[PDB]
mmCIF file with all atom_site columns, C-alpha atoms in Angstrom:
data_model
loop_
_atom_site.group_PDB
_atom_site.id
_atom_site.type_symbol
_atom_site.label_atom_id
_atom_site.label_alt_id
_atom_site.label_comp_id
_atom_site.label_asym_id
_atom_site.label_entity_id
_atom_site.label_seq_id
_atom_site.pdbx_PDB_ins_code
_atom_site.Cartn_x
_atom_site.Cartn_y
_atom_site.Cartn_z
_atom_site.occupancy
_atom_site.B_iso_or_equiv
_atom_site.pdbx_formal_charge
_atom_site.auth_seq_id
_atom_site.auth_comp_id
_atom_site.auth_asym_id
_atom_site.auth_atom_id
_atom_site.pdbx_PDB_model_num
ATOM 1   C CA . UNK A 1 1   ? 178.894 180.690 56.380 1.00 41.80 ? 1   UNK A CA 1
ATOM 2   C CA . UNK A 1 2   ? 177.069 181.767 59.463 1.00 41.36 ? 2   UNK A CA 1
ATOM 3   C CA . UNK A 1 3   ? 178.054 185.516 58.683 1.00 42.03 ? 3   UNK A CA 1
ATOM 4   C CA . UNK A 1 4   ? 175.652 187.296 56.278 1.00 38.38 ? 4   UNK A CA 1
ATOM 5   C CA . UNK A 1 5   ? 178.437 188.791 54.249 1.00 35.49 ? 5   UNK A CA 1
ATOM 6   C CA . UNK A 1 6   ? 179.537 185.431 52.778 1.00 35.20 ? 6   UNK A CA 1
ATOM 7   C CA . UNK A 1 7   ? 176.396 185.521 50.739 1.00 32.47 ? 7   UNK A CA 1
ATOM 8   C CA . UNK A 1 8   ? 177.131 188.795 48.877 1.00 33.07 ? 8   UNK A CA 1
ATOM 9   C CA . UNK A 1 9   ? 179.229 187.185 46.055 1.00 30.30 ? 9   UNK A CA 1
ATOM 10  C CA . UNK A 1 10  ? 176.385 184.799 45.633 1.00 34.87 ? 10  UNK A CA 1
ATOM 11  C CA . UNK A 1 11  ? 173.599 187.385 45.554 1.00 33.31 ? 11  UNK A CA 1
ATOM 12  C CA . UNK A 1 12  ? 175.689 189.591 43.122 1.00 35.85 ? 12  UNK A CA 1
ATOM 13  C CA . UNK A 1 13  ? 176.891 186.807 40.716 1.00 35.29 ? 13  UNK A CA 1
ATOM 14  C CA . UNK A 1 14  ? 173.333 185.702 40.531 1.00 37.12 ? 14  UNK A CA 1
ATOM 15  C CA . UNK A 1 15  ? 171.780 189.322 39.701 1.00 32.65 ? 15  UNK A CA 1
ATOM 16  C CA . UNK A 1 16  ? 174.800 189.510 37.211 1.00 33.55 ? 16  UNK A CA 1
ATOM 17  C CA . UNK A 1 17  ? 173.512 186.349 35.592 1.00 34.93 ? 17  UNK A CA 1
ATOM 18  C CA . UNK A 1 18  ? 169.802 187.283 35.396 1.00 31.50 ? 18  UNK A CA 1
ATOM 19  C CA . UNK A 1 19  ? 170.796 190.549 33.930 1.00 34.98 ? 19  UNK A CA 1
ATOM 20  C CA . UNK A 1 20  ? 172.368 188.847 30.886 1.00 32.38 ? 20  UNK A CA 1
ATOM 21  C CA . UNK A 1 21  ? 169.406 186.216 30.640 1.00 33.16 ? 21  UNK A CA 1
ATOM 22  C CA . UNK A 1 22  ? 166.527 188.668 31.185 1.00 31.84 ? 22  UNK A CA 1
ATOM 23  C CA . UNK A 1 23  ? 166.160 189.178 27.353 1.00 34.11 ? 23  UNK A CA 1
ATOM 24  C CA . UNK A 1 24  ? 166.384 185.445 26.382 1.00 34.63 ? 24  UNK A CA 1
ATOM 25  C CA . UNK A 1 25  ? 163.618 184.891 29.106 1.00 34.27 ? 25  UNK A CA 1
ATOM 26  C CA . UNK A 1 26  ? 165.404 182.749 31.630 1.00 35.41 ? 26  UNK A CA 1
ATOM 27  C CA . UNK A 1 27  ? 166.132 183.402 35.238 1.00 32.55 ? 27  UNK A CA 1
ATOM 28  C CA . UNK A 1 28  ? 168.313 181.891 38.065 1.00 29.75 ? 28  UNK A CA 1
ATOM 29  C CA . UNK A 1 29  ? 166.712 181.803 41.572 1.00 30.10 ? 29  UNK A CA 1
ATOM 30  C CA . UNK A 1 30  ? 169.474 179.507 43.043 1.00 31.12 ? 30  UNK A CA 1
ATOM 31  C CA . UNK A 1 31  ? 172.890 179.143 41.371 1.00 28.68 ? 31  UNK A CA 1
ATOM 32  C CA . UNK A 1 32  ? 173.492 175.853 43.200 1.00 29.85 ? 32  UNK A CA 1
ATOM 33  C CA . UNK A 1 33  ? 170.467 174.037 41.498 1.00 30.90 ? 33  UNK A CA 1
ATOM 34  C CA . UNK A 1 34  ? 169.427 176.174 38.433 1.00 33.15 ? 34  UNK A CA 1
ATOM 35  C CA . UNK A 1 35  ? 172.435 175.593 36.200 1.00 32.08 ? 35  UNK A CA 1
ATOM 36  C CA . UNK A 1 36  ? 172.797 171.861 36.724 1.00 31.55 ? 36  UNK A CA 1
ATOM 37  C CA . UNK A 1 37  ? 170.880 170.795 33.702 1.00 28.86 ? 37  UNK A CA 1
ATOM 38  C CA . UNK A 1 38  ? 173.099 172.984 31.567 1.00 28.11 ? 38  UNK A CA 1
ATOM 39  C CA . UNK A 1 39  ? 170.244 174.779 29.761 1.00 29.49 ? 39  UNK A CA 1
ATOM 40  C CA . UNK A 1 40  ? 170.617 178.291 31.513 1.00 29.19 ? 40  UNK A CA 1
ATOM 41  C CA . UNK A 1 41  ? 174.411 177.931 31.507 1.00 27.31 ? 41  UNK A CA 1
ATOM 42  C CA . UNK A 1 42  ? 173.961 177.667 27.668 1.00 28.49 ? 42  UNK A CA 1
ATOM 43  C CA . UNK A 1 43  ? 171.611 180.511 27.400 1.00 29.02 ? 43  UNK A CA 1
ATOM 44  C CA . UNK A 1 44  ? 174.066 182.637 29.372 1.00 27.98 ? 44  UNK A CA 1
ATOM 45  C CA . UNK A 1 45  ? 177.017 181.650 27.171 1.00 28.27 ? 45  UNK A CA 1
ATOM 46  C CA . UNK A 1 46  ? 175.140 182.446 24.025 1.00 26.59 ? 46  UNK A CA 1
ATOM 47  C CA . UNK A 1 47  ? 174.108 185.872 25.114 1.00 28.76 ? 47  UNK A CA 1
ATOM 48  C CA . UNK A 1 48  ? 177.522 186.949 26.337 1.00 26.46 ? 48  UNK A CA 1
ATOM 49  C CA . UNK A 1 49  ? 179.452 185.469 23.348 1.00 26.97 ? 49  UNK A CA 1
ATOM 50  C CA . UNK A 1 50  ? 176.803 186.904 20.975 1.00 27.58 ? 50  UNK A CA 1
ATOM 51  C CA . UNK A 1 51  ? 177.542 183.388 19.320 1.00 28.78 ? 51  UNK A CA 1
ATOM 52  C CA . UNK A 1 52  ? 175.709 180.106 19.081 1.00 30.86 ? 52  UNK A CA 1
ATOM 53  C CA . UNK A 1 53  ? 177.192 176.709 20.453 1.00 32.54 ? 53  UNK A CA 1
ATOM 54  C CA . UNK A 1 54  ? 179.229 174.697 17.980 1.00 29.00 ? 54  UNK A CA 1
ATOM 55  C CA . UNK A 1 55  ? 177.083 171.606 18.372 1.00 31.15 ? 55  UNK A CA 1
ATOM 56  C CA . UNK A 1 56  ? 173.601 170.472 19.485 1.00 30.65 ? 56  UNK A CA 1
ATOM 57  C CA . UNK A 1 57  ? 172.456 169.938 23.144 1.00 31.23 ? 57  UNK A CA 1
ATOM 58  C CA . UNK A 1 58  ? 169.866 168.077 24.933 1.00 30.46 ? 58  UNK A CA 1
ATOM 59  C CA . UNK A 1 59  ? 166.877 170.343 24.859 1.00 29.83 ? 59  UNK A CA 1
ATOM 60  C CA . UNK A 1 60  ? 164.869 168.073 27.378 1.00 31.16 ? 60  UNK A CA 1
ATOM 61  C CA . UNK A 1 61  ? 167.565 166.733 29.766 1.00 31.22 ? 61  UNK A CA 1
ATOM 62  C CA . UNK A 1 62  ? 165.466 164.608 31.994 1.00 31.65 ? 62  UNK A CA 1
ATOM 63  C CA . UNK A 1 63  ? 168.250 162.347 33.357 1.00 33.80 ? 63  UNK A CA 1
ATOM 64  C CA . UNK A 1 64  ? 171.822 163.067 34.435 1.00 35.67 ? 64  UNK A CA 1
ATOM 65  C CA . UNK A 1 65  ? 173.785 161.663 31.498 1.00 39.28 ? 65  UNK A CA 1
ATOM 66  C CA . UNK A 1 66  ? 171.983 164.325 29.352 1.00 42.50 ? 66  UNK A CA 1
ATOM 67  C CA . UNK A 1 67  ? 172.712 167.051 31.929 1.00 44.69 ? 67  UNK A CA 1
ATOM 68  C CA . UNK A 1 68  ? 176.415 166.132 31.873 1.00 44.97 ? 68  UNK A CA 1
ATOM 69  C CA . UNK A 1 69  ? 176.323 166.162 27.966 1.00 44.56 ? 69  UNK A CA 1
ATOM 70  C CA . UNK A 1 70  ? 174.733 169.750 28.136 1.00 43.17 ? 70  UNK A CA 1
ATOM 71  C CA . UNK A 1 71  ? 177.254 170.907 30.627 1.00 38.15 ? 71  UNK A CA 1
ATOM 72  C CA . UNK A 1 72  ? 180.049 169.405 28.479 1.00 38.26 ? 72  UNK A CA 1
ATOM 73  C CA . UNK A 1 73  ? 178.836 171.593 25.568 1.00 37.81 ? 73  UNK A CA 1
ATOM 74  C CA . UNK A 1 74  ? 179.102 174.744 27.628 1.00 38.23 ? 74  UNK A CA 1
ATOM 75  C CA . UNK A 1 75  ? 182.504 173.817 28.781 1.00 38.24 ? 75  UNK A CA 1
ATOM 76  C CA . UNK A 1 76  ? 183.808 172.780 25.308 1.00 38.70 ? 76  UNK A CA 1
ATOM 77  C CA . UNK A 1 77  ? 182.559 176.198 23.927 1.00 38.22 ? 77  UNK A CA 1
ATOM 78  C CA . UNK A 1 78  ? 184.682 177.802 26.604 1.00 39.81 ? 78  UNK A CA 1
ATOM 79  C CA . UNK A 1 79  ? 187.792 175.667 25.444 1.00 40.87 ? 79  UNK A CA 1
ATOM 80  C CA . UNK A 1 80  ? 186.855 176.783 21.808 1.00 42.23 ? 80  UNK A CA 1
ATOM 81  C CA . UNK A 1 81  ? 186.774 180.396 22.807 1.00 38.07 ? 81  UNK A CA 1
ATOM 82  C CA . UNK A 1 82  ? 190.155 180.487 24.730 1.00 36.94 ? 82  UNK A CA 1
ATOM 83  C CA . UNK A 1 83  ? 188.495 181.098 28.218 1.00 40.48 ? 83  UNK A CA 1
ATOM 84  C CA . UNK A 1 84  ? 190.690 179.027 30.583 1.00 43.21 ? 84  UNK A CA 1
ATOM 85  C CA . UNK A 1 85  ? 188.708 177.638 33.638 1.00 42.12 ? 85  UNK A CA 1
ATOM 86  C CA . UNK A 1 86  ? 189.573 177.069 37.449 1.00 44.87 ? 86  UNK A CA 1
ATOM 87  C CA . UNK A 1 87  ? 189.215 173.175 38.044 1.00 46.06 ? 87  UNK A CA 1
ATOM 88  C CA . UNK A 1 88  ? 185.816 173.014 36.394 1.00 44.67 ? 88  UNK A CA 1
ATOM 89  C CA . UNK A 1 89  ? 184.363 169.795 35.106 1.00 45.33 ? 89  UNK A CA 1
ATOM 90  C CA . UNK A 1 90  ? 180.812 168.653 34.233 1.00 46.96 ? 90  UNK A CA 1
ATOM 91  C CA . UNK A 1 91  ? 179.921 166.950 37.432 1.00 45.93 ? 91  UNK A CA 1
ATOM 92  C CA . UNK A 1 92  ? 180.818 170.003 39.366 1.00 43.93 ? 92  UNK A CA 1
ATOM 93  C CA . UNK A 1 93  ? 177.949 171.777 37.763 1.00 44.54 ? 93  UNK A CA 1
ATOM 94  C CA . UNK A 1 94  ? 175.346 168.943 37.545 1.00 44.50 ? 94  UNK A CA 1
ATOM 95  C CA . UNK A 1 95  ? 176.073 168.019 41.247 1.00 42.61 ? 95  UNK A CA 1
ATOM 96  C CA . UNK A 1 96  ? 175.721 171.521 42.450 1.00 41.49 ? 96  UNK A CA 1
ATOM 97  C CA . UNK A 1 97  ? 179.275 172.277 43.716 1.00 43.06 ? 97  UNK A CA 1
ATOM 98  C CA . UNK A 1 98  ? 178.518 175.985 44.834 1.00 42.34 ? 98  UNK A CA 1
ATOM 99  C CA . UNK A 1 99  ? 182.204 177.003 45.282 1.00 41.36 ? 99  UNK A CA 1
ATOM 100 C CA . UNK A 1 100 ? 183.060 175.629 41.711 1.00 42.88 ? 100 UNK A CA 1
ATOM 101 C CA . UNK A 1 101 ? 180.032 177.164 40.195 1.00 41.87 ? 101 UNK A CA 1
ATOM 102 C CA . UNK A 1 102 ? 180.718 180.653 41.940 1.00 42.91 ? 102 UNK A CA 1
ATOM 103 C CA . UNK A 1 103 ? 184.251 180.343 40.590 1.00 42.25 ? 103 UNK A CA 1
ATOM 104 C CA . UNK A 1 104 ? 182.959 179.574 37.033 1.00 47.39 ? 104 UNK A CA 1
ATOM 105 C CA . UNK A 1 105 ? 180.744 182.750 36.985 1.00 49.91 ? 105 UNK A CA 1
ATOM 106 C CA . UNK A 1 106 ? 183.548 184.810 38.230 1.00 48.91 ? 106 UNK A CA 1
ATOM 107 C CA . UNK A 1 107 ? 185.762 183.475 35.264 1.00 45.96 ? 107 UNK A CA 1
ATOM 108 C CA . UNK A 1 108 ? 182.986 184.575 32.981 1.00 42.84 ? 108 UNK A CA 1
ATOM 109 C CA . UNK A 1 109 ? 182.433 188.096 34.448 1.00 42.86 ? 109 UNK A CA 1
ATOM 110 C CA . UNK A 1 110 ? 186.218 188.485 34.455 1.00 42.30 ? 110 UNK A CA 1
ATOM 111 C CA . UNK A 1 111 ? 186.365 187.611 30.792 1.00 44.49 ? 111 UNK A CA 1
ATOM 112 C CA . UNK A 1 112 ? 183.310 189.120 29.268 1.00 45.88 ? 112 UNK A CA 1
ATOM 113 C CA . UNK A 1 113 ? 182.797 192.062 31.501 1.00 43.25 ? 113 UNK A CA 1
ATOM 114 C CA . UNK A 1 114 ? 186.298 193.262 32.295 1.00 44.78 ? 114 UNK A CA 1
ATOM 115 C CA . UNK A 1 115 ? 188.954 191.630 30.112 1.00 46.12 ? 115 UNK A CA 1
ATOM 116 C CA . UNK A 1 116 ? 187.179 191.880 26.801 1.00 46.58 ? 116 UNK A CA 1
ATOM 117 C CA . UNK A 1 117 ? 185.848 195.552 26.623 1.00 45.12 ? 117 UNK A CA 1
ATOM 118 C CA . UNK A 1 118 ? 189.137 196.790 27.868 1.00 45.52 ? 118 UNK A CA 1
ATOM 119 C CA . UNK A 1 119 ? 191.038 195.907 24.540 1.00 42.35 ? 119 UNK A CA 1
ATOM 120 C CA . UNK A 1 120 ? 198.753 195.801 28.122 1.00 39.37 ? 120 UNK A CA 1
ATOM 121 C CA . UNK A 1 121 ? 199.765 192.103 27.895 1.00 42.97 ? 121 UNK A CA 1
ATOM 122 C CA . UNK A 1 122 ? 201.431 192.726 31.160 1.00 40.95 ? 122 UNK A CA 1
ATOM 123 C CA . UNK A 1 123 ? 198.296 194.176 32.688 1.00 40.64 ? 123 UNK A CA 1
ATOM 124 C CA . UNK A 1 124 ? 195.864 192.033 34.692 1.00 41.42 ? 124 UNK A CA 1
ATOM 125 C CA . UNK A 1 125 ? 192.100 192.685 34.373 1.00 38.77 ? 125 UNK A CA 1
ATOM 126 C CA . UNK A 1 126 ? 191.940 193.833 38.029 1.00 38.11 ? 126 UNK A CA 1
ATOM 127 C CA . UNK A 1 127 ? 194.683 196.240 36.965 1.00 39.23 ? 127 UNK A CA 1
ATOM 128 C CA . UNK A 1 128 ? 192.711 197.437 33.781 1.00 35.61 ? 128 UNK A CA 1
ATOM 129 C CA . UNK A 1 129 ? 189.677 198.258 35.773 1.00 34.40 ? 129 UNK A CA 1
ATOM 130 C CA . UNK A 1 130 ? 191.676 199.804 38.624 1.00 37.82 ? 130 UNK A CA 1
ATOM 131 C CA . UNK A 1 131 ? 193.324 202.045 36.057 1.00 35.40 ? 131 UNK A CA 1
ATOM 132 C CA . UNK A 1 132 ? 190.091 202.986 34.409 1.00 37.15 ? 132 UNK A CA 1
ATOM 133 C CA . UNK A 1 133 ? 188.584 204.017 37.715 1.00 38.21 ? 133 UNK A CA 1
ATOM 134 C CA . UNK A 1 134 ? 191.748 206.016 38.649 1.00 38.72 ? 134 UNK A CA 1
ATOM 135 C CA . UNK A 1 135 ? 191.722 207.747 35.286 1.00 41.26 ? 135 UNK A CA 1
ATOM 136 C CA . UNK A 1 136 ? 188.004 208.873 36.045 1.00 40.89 ? 136 UNK A CA 1
ATOM 137 C CA . UNK A 1 137 ? 188.956 209.852 39.447 1.00 42.78 ? 137 UNK A CA 1
ATOM 138 C CA . UNK A 1 138 ? 192.548 211.454 39.443 1.00 44.55 ? 138 UNK A CA 1
ATOM 139 C CA . UNK A 1 139 ? 191.823 213.375 42.717 1.00 43.47 ? 139 UNK A CA 1
ATOM 140 C CA . UNK A 1 140 ? 191.197 210.161 44.621 1.00 40.63 ? 140 UNK A CA 1
ATOM 141 C CA . UNK A 1 141 ? 193.794 207.650 45.920 1.00 43.73 ? 141 UNK A CA 1
ATOM 142 C CA . UNK A 1 142 ? 191.967 204.548 44.486 1.00 43.00 ? 142 UNK A CA 1
ATOM 143 C CA . UNK A 1 143 ? 193.867 201.395 45.213 1.00 47.28 ? 143 UNK A CA 1
ATOM 144 C CA . UNK A 1 144 ? 191.347 198.646 46.063 1.00 46.32 ? 144 UNK A CA 1
ATOM 145 C CA . UNK A 1 145 ? 187.736 197.343 45.537 1.00 47.95 ? 145 UNK A CA 1
ATOM 146 C CA . UNK A 1 146 ? 186.486 197.371 49.094 1.00 47.36 ? 146 UNK A CA 1
ATOM 147 C CA . UNK A 1 147 ? 187.481 199.836 51.696 1.00 46.53 ? 147 UNK A CA 1
ATOM 148 C CA . UNK A 1 148 ? 187.676 202.606 49.106 1.00 47.25 ? 148 UNK A CA 1
ATOM 149 C CA . UNK A 1 149 ? 184.023 202.330 48.530 1.00 47.10 ? 149 UNK A CA 1
ATOM 150 C CA . UNK A 1 150 ? 182.607 201.887 51.935 1.00 44.04 ? 150 UNK A CA 1
ATOM 151 C CA . UNK A 1 151 ? 181.538 205.566 52.675 1.00 45.91 ? 151 UNK A CA 1
ATOM 152 C CA . UNK A 1 152 ? 179.717 205.738 49.510 1.00 45.92 ? 152 UNK A CA 1
ATOM 153 C CA . UNK A 1 153 ? 181.494 208.862 48.350 1.00 44.45 ? 153 UNK A CA 1
ATOM 154 C CA . UNK A 1 154 ? 183.799 207.261 45.716 1.00 47.13 ? 154 UNK A CA 1
ATOM 155 C CA . UNK A 1 155 ? 180.589 206.008 44.182 1.00 46.60 ? 155 UNK A CA 1
ATOM 156 C CA . UNK A 1 156 ? 179.132 209.643 43.983 1.00 50.85 ? 156 UNK A CA 1
ATOM 157 C CA . UNK A 1 157 ? 182.445 210.633 42.563 1.00 49.20 ? 157 UNK A CA 1
ATOM 158 C CA . UNK A 1 158 ? 182.540 207.990 39.878 1.00 48.85 ? 158 UNK A CA 1
ATOM 159 C CA . UNK A 1 159 ? 179.131 208.574 38.744 1.00 50.33 ? 159 UNK A CA 1
ATOM 160 C CA . UNK A 1 160 ? 179.488 212.271 38.487 1.00 52.81 ? 160 UNK A CA 1
ATOM 161 C CA . UNK A 1 161 ? 182.735 211.732 36.649 1.00 50.81 ? 161 UNK A CA 1
ATOM 162 C CA . UNK A 1 162 ? 180.629 209.846 34.135 1.00 48.33 ? 162 UNK A CA 1
ATOM 163 C CA . UNK A 1 163 ? 177.818 212.282 33.818 1.00 45.38 ? 163 UNK A CA 1
ATOM 164 C CA . UNK A 1 164 ? 178.695 215.575 35.565 1.00 43.91 ? 164 UNK A CA 1
ATOM 165 C CA . UNK A 1 165 ? 175.734 216.867 37.475 1.00 44.43 ? 165 UNK A CA 1
ATOM 166 C CA . UNK A 1 166 ? 174.311 213.457 38.574 1.00 42.70 ? 166 UNK A CA 1
ATOM 167 C CA . UNK A 1 167 ? 176.120 213.628 41.987 1.00 38.59 ? 167 UNK A CA 1
ATOM 168 C CA . UNK A 1 168 ? 177.649 217.024 41.988 1.00 42.88 ? 168 UNK A CA 1
ATOM 169 C CA . UNK A 1 169 ? 178.076 217.432 45.814 1.00 41.41 ? 169 UNK A CA 1
ATOM 170 C CA . UNK A 1 170 ? 179.717 214.079 46.507 1.00 40.69 ? 170 UNK A CA 1
ATOM 171 C CA . UNK A 1 171 ? 182.670 215.475 48.391 1.00 41.34 ? 171 UNK A CA 1
ATOM 172 C CA . UNK A 1 172 ? 180.346 217.133 50.880 1.00 41.31 ? 172 UNK A CA 1
ATOM 173 C CA . UNK A 1 173 ? 178.438 213.769 51.502 1.00 44.20 ? 173 UNK A CA 1
ATOM 174 C CA . UNK A 1 174 ? 178.505 212.643 55.181 1.00 42.63 ? 174 UNK A CA 1
ATOM 175 C CA . UNK A 1 175 ? 180.688 209.431 55.527 1.00 42.30 ? 175 UNK A CA 1
ATOM 176 C CA . UNK A 1 176 ? 178.571 208.359 58.471 1.00 46.85 ? 176 UNK A CA 1
ATOM 177 C CA . UNK A 1 177 ? 175.756 207.670 56.012 1.00 48.22 ? 177 UNK A CA 1
ATOM 178 C CA . UNK A 1 178 ? 177.364 205.015 53.822 1.00 47.44 ? 178 UNK A CA 1
ATOM 179 C CA . UNK A 1 179 ? 174.010 203.335 52.702 1.00 46.24 ? 179 UNK A CA 1
ATOM 180 C CA . UNK A 1 180 ? 172.215 206.664 51.922 1.00 47.34 ? 180 UNK A CA 1
ATOM 181 C CA . UNK A 1 181 ? 175.157 207.667 49.890 1.00 47.56 ? 181 UNK A CA 1
ATOM 182 C CA . UNK A 1 182 ? 175.645 204.488 47.998 1.00 47.35 ? 182 UNK A CA 1
ATOM 183 C CA . UNK A 1 183 ? 172.014 204.304 47.173 1.00 46.90 ? 183 UNK A CA 1
ATOM 184 C CA . UNK A 1 184 ? 171.893 207.854 45.906 1.00 45.46 ? 184 UNK A CA 1
ATOM 185 C CA . UNK A 1 185 ? 174.848 207.273 43.666 1.00 49.50 ? 185 UNK A CA 1
ATOM 186 C CA . UNK A 1 186 ? 173.789 203.881 42.344 1.00 49.64 ? 186 UNK A CA 1
ATOM 187 C CA . UNK A 1 187 ? 170.335 204.976 41.602 1.00 50.19 ? 187 UNK A CA 1
ATOM 188 C CA . UNK A 1 188 ? 171.578 207.921 39.593 1.00 50.37 ? 188 UNK A CA 1
ATOM 189 C CA . UNK A 1 189 ? 173.809 205.464 37.655 1.00 49.31 ? 189 UNK A CA 1
ATOM 190 C CA . UNK A 1 190 ? 170.713 203.208 37.225 1.00 45.96 ? 190 UNK A CA 1
ATOM 191 C CA . UNK A 1 191 ? 168.427 206.023 35.898 1.00 41.39 ? 191 UNK A CA 1
ATOM 192 C CA . UNK A 1 192 ? 170.942 208.021 33.810 1.00 42.48 ? 192 UNK A CA 1
ATOM 193 C CA . UNK A 1 193 ? 173.938 205.693 32.978 1.00 45.66 ? 193 UNK A CA 1
ATOM 194 C CA . UNK A 1 194 ? 172.171 202.399 32.352 1.00 46.02 ? 194 UNK A CA 1
ATOM 195 C CA . UNK A 1 195 ? 174.052 200.580 35.241 1.00 46.99 ? 195 UNK A CA 1
ATOM 196 C CA . UNK A 1 196 ? 171.991 198.040 36.955 1.00 44.18 ? 196 UNK A CA 1
ATOM 197 C CA . UNK A 1 197 ? 172.143 197.324 40.651 1.00 44.10 ? 197 UNK A CA 1
ATOM 198 C CA . UNK A 1 198 ? 173.580 193.892 40.570 1.00 44.33 ? 198 UNK A CA 1
ATOM 199 C CA . UNK A 1 199 ? 175.065 194.626 44.015 1.00 44.93 ? 199 UNK A CA 1
ATOM 200 C CA . UNK A 1 200 ? 172.833 196.395 46.445 1.00 43.37 ? 200 UNK A CA 1
ATOM 201 C CA . UNK A 1 201 ? 173.638 199.660 48.220 1.00 43.45 ? 201 UNK A CA 1
ATOM 202 C CA . UNK A 1 202 ? 173.575 197.761 51.624 1.00 42.30 ? 202 UNK A CA 1
ATOM 203 C CA . UNK A 1 203 ? 175.878 194.992 50.275 1.00 43.20 ? 203 UNK A CA 1
ATOM 204 C CA . UNK A 1 204 ? 178.466 197.444 48.583 1.00 41.62 ? 204 UNK A CA 1
ATOM 205 C CA . UNK A 1 205 ? 179.127 199.421 51.810 1.00 44.38 ? 205 UNK A CA 1
ATOM 206 C CA . UNK A 1 206 ? 179.234 196.348 53.989 1.00 46.37 ? 206 UNK A CA 1
ATOM 207 C CA . UNK A 1 207 ? 182.354 196.065 56.067 1.00 48.37 ? 207 UNK A CA 1
ATOM 208 C CA . UNK A 1 208 ? 183.248 192.565 54.820 1.00 47.88 ? 208 UNK A CA 1
ATOM 209 C CA . UNK A 1 209 ? 182.136 192.951 51.158 1.00 47.05 ? 209 UNK A CA 1
ATOM 210 C CA . UNK A 1 210 ? 184.429 190.870 48.963 1.00 47.33 ? 210 UNK A CA 1
ATOM 211 C CA . UNK A 1 211 ? 186.308 192.477 46.071 1.00 49.16 ? 211 UNK A CA 1
ATOM 212 C CA . UNK A 1 212 ? 184.757 190.344 43.395 1.00 48.42 ? 212 UNK A CA 1
ATOM 213 C CA . UNK A 1 213 ? 181.269 191.668 44.153 1.00 49.11 ? 213 UNK A CA 1
ATOM 214 C CA . UNK A 1 214 ? 182.352 195.207 43.959 1.00 48.75 ? 214 UNK A CA 1
ATOM 215 C CA . UNK A 1 215 ? 184.414 194.439 40.675 1.00 46.19 ? 215 UNK A CA 1
ATOM 216 C CA . UNK A 1 216 ? 181.360 192.830 39.188 1.00 43.11 ? 216 UNK A CA 1
ATOM 217 C CA . UNK A 1 217 ? 179.264 196.024 39.891 1.00 47.73 ? 217 UNK A CA 1
ATOM 218 C CA . UNK A 1 218 ? 181.977 198.589 38.796 1.00 50.45 ? 218 UNK A CA 1
ATOM 219 C CA . UNK A 1 219 ? 182.960 196.601 35.606 1.00 48.88 ? 219 UNK A CA 1
ATOM 220 C CA . UNK A 1 220 ? 179.686 197.604 34.143 1.00 48.67 ? 220 UNK A CA 1
ATOM 221 C CA . UNK A 1 221 ? 180.845 201.365 34.042 1.00 50.70 ? 221 UNK A CA 1
ATOM 222 C CA . UNK A 1 222 ? 183.366 201.000 31.110 1.00 49.22 ? 222 UNK A CA 1
ATOM 223 C CA . UNK A 1 223 ? 181.744 198.049 29.351 1.00 49.12 ? 223 UNK A CA 1
ATOM 224 C CA . UNK A 1 224 ? 179.001 200.844 28.957 1.00 46.88 ? 224 UNK A CA 1
ATOM 225 C CA . UNK A 1 225 ? 181.953 202.782 27.414 1.00 44.25 ? 225 UNK A CA 1
ATOM 226 C CA . UNK A 1 226 ? 181.636 205.784 29.680 1.00 43.85 ? 226 UNK A CA 1
#
């Protein structure tokens, strides 16, 4: 983690998180520290499930035993809801294990933002979303969530697919201007489709952008049932 690209998933997951907590008045500044007492994790779970937790929690969790109980309430909720998790336990969150915490948020995005608004038992959520984009853009070979998006042009194309007239000249856009294109597209999706910029233009056309960051951004397109 010298290289500035390794930070993209973290940036993007965190903006994803804030987007869902912005109306219950919380925000994360640092995912490694700001979920450790369990309170913001609970705020997030409640907004995404549109439910309330099954039992009470420690509203003022001054010491670690209380923070572990809080986190164990988020985690049981998730068992209760049938969201399987990747090697997650309470101490992982309270102790600030960043790789496990990034993985938890990904499990959430994958479930709430991709798997749940798409209804295909033998169809993976990566596959559902791939298929949704391919259906909006039948004239583009769309096979991945990285290199296909690097020029900015598939973005123009998807946004215009969704609201024709927003990026009508996408196919004449200069692929040597990947940031300019990305920004033009993603602003038009911001302004006219409601799609927030949880990944930045610079980040989305980065040579080493990870697919999970890009899926996070794109998954907002059909959860907004376009």
